[PDB]
Amino acid sequence: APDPVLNELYGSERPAVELLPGVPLSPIVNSCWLPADAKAMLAESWIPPAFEAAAPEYNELVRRLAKTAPFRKWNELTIQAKQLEQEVAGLKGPDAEAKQAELENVKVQIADAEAAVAEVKQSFSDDPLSLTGWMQALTDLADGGMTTFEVSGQGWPYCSLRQLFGEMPSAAPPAGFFDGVERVLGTFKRRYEKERGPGSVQLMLKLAPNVFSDAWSTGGAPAAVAAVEAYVERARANVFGPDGGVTPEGVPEPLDLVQLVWWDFAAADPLPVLKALQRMATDQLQVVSVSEPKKIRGIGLVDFPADRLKAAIQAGVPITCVQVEHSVLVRSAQPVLDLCAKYGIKVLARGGTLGGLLSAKYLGAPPPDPVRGDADLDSVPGCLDAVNNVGGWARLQAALAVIKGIADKHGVKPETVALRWQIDAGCFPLVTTRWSSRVWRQFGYEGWSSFEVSGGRPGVDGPLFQVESFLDVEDVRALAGLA
Amino acid sequence: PEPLPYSFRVLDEKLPMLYVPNVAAEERVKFFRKFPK
């Protein structure tokens, strides 16, 4: 059976997949780059003639409310009430009494559903962070079909190197890089799961231990296991608030997935941290009776070379996914793809569009300049590094012209072609979300910010989420020739 | 007392592959002919 969300939205027959036995996985994964700091984002508030046609109450809430489960249940219950009223009026017999009992039951159900509807409508107005720009952006993204997320940000080398490889004071809390992103995504997750669905939105974290720190080096393996345990505890405190971190039965609800990113292999081997995370992912049975319940549902790895991934496999670590950089113009890690195909572990493809550089523009434009700055891309110096690794701006221009021709052959944006090429190689895409009137720009769509032009449709196109590829053999030959 | 043979580490720690670059360094390695190798 196909995914119902992708059935109605894109007429897609793609059946839903599962990253782990419990958690699902969207066809495309959203890497989440914050436009501003979390402090400047967690403080935003949506709360500002007798009728304001432009007031947010009549505009944003009427859309954000009809998407909640209580309202859908209310509408369905009203539908069944009207129907069963029609049949009970038609019948007029001994069965009509039982049917009238059913109508009374659905009446009290309607009553409680309407009470919940009023509750959620009030819950809209009594919290400031809801209905903001970024919260609405992620809500629209999740409603588009990409319910999986990935904490990421400006990273080595284009970021502050003192916030990565710097020695914090002893009094500092055990908070690492990619911290505020977890808080923002946790706020979004809790809000979305309160509005609709118990576990609708997934979240895949990222652990970046500073292996070059004095404490890590001088400590050893106990220091490593203590550090990873502390990170897991802090991440649990972030994704789930201080209340609600544990299920009512008393067993903690575990995280979805933790991604380990290692900075240097000749400095410290990742065996101790991998074993510690495996032990945190498994529950230690005693007799049978579960003891030390699982805190992490799975473990993934980031950018490990093929030999290191094989060495981690050979040590019993249950690796479930690996993300690598593999685009239509960069194919530097083929061995990892073959190794994952052999061992049957999912692979995630970061890149694809080279950071929005395969867009409609840049077709004949000069290279972007860091000091002057470009805003349609996510990271200008990263884009220039991608350009240099491709070979130069001329080769990128030729490749972009070829891709644009392929796109105009079918009628798609120049970026869906690259994303479908990534999907065809087996790997799952990894697209960076865009902010602040540039929403859906990562998929190529333009001028999609307002509801007047969008009409509620997602800023994606069907051919990208399709079981059969739209790339003909000539297109495949050309893209393979791009290299 | 008899040291536990190092091959039992595979069963006890449930680790699939073990590699001892130098049996001289290790002490749980067992020699069948009873002569140090």
């Binding site: 284009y158 970021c159 190197l161 000069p366 300049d369 860091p370 000091v371 220039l384 | -």
Partner: protein
């Protein structure tokens, strides 16, 4: 020949001209310029100068740029500036407006060391010190920025790149050998089409080293070593030009 000016060469050849930096600051620059260079995407980032302050925490200013284009008949280098009180940490030097620069021009004397000060001008106006510093730095940069003539060259896509086949400036004891970076390589505009007495040149022929000192801004120095084919410029002092120049000549 050289791709980027070398800081140690600049400090070694300008030692006589009085353009010097402290030992701690020298080592800190050595260790910290690459870090700030790679944090941004800048292909080039070098020390620009050292402005003197009143408390004793001199302002070290560095400038960088990625690519050098030619636009509206001139070489437009898109530059970014950073400042610091110690050689370790580099902070951004924000660009100022136009009227704010006009007001900048009316503050004289050395600015104090604290970047949180405010100057009062005249209806009253509040001028931050960082704005004054940026105003002075951009004024000096616009006025005097020397490179040897034809040491750069155009190319495909019309970007001003270094000229790897640079033969060396002939007759380098004269101002026709040097030019402002903004002047296009092909054009004949050089350091001789400006005022007749605002540049001094000393030359050692045996060692083959030329020193060009700006008299409009008495802190701007430049060296050109012909045997090694290496050039570099520095500024040391407060960002004040001596308007009473004529009586000095």
């Amino acid at each position: 020949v050289q791709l980027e000016p070398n800081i140690t060469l600049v400090l070694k050849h300008l030692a006589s001209c009085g353009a010097v930096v402290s030992a701690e600051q020298q080592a800190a620059l050595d260790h910290s310029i690459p870090i700030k260079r790679i944090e941004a995407g800048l292909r080039s980032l070098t020390l620009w100068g050292r402005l003197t302050t009143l408390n004793g925490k001199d302002y070290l200013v560095a400038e960088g740029y990625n690519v050098a284009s030619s636009k509206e008949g001139a070489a437009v280098y898109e530059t970014k500036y950073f400042y610091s009180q110690d050689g370790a940490r580099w902070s951004d030097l924000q660009p100022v407006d136009s009227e704010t620069a006009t007001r900048c021009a009316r503050i004289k004397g050395m600015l104090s060391g604290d970047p949180a000060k405010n100057y009062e001008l005249e209806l009253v106006f509040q001028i931050p010190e960082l704005a004054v510093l940026r105003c002075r730095v951009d004024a000096i940069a616009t006025a005097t920025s020397v490179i040897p003539t034809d040491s750069t060259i155009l190319n495909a896509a019309s970007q001003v790149v270094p000229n790897r086949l640079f033969a060396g400036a002939a007759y380098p004891e004269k101002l026709e050998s040097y030019q402002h970076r903004f002047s296009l390589p092909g054009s004949g505009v050089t350091l001789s089409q400006d005022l007749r007495g605002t540049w001094a040149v000393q030359y050692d022929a045996f060692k083959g080293v030329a020193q060009v000192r700006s008299l409009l801004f008495p802190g701007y120095f430049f060296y050109y070593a012909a045997n090694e084919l290496t050039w570099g410029s520095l500024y040391v002092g407060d960002g004040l030009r001596n308007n009473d120049l004529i009586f000095m000549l």
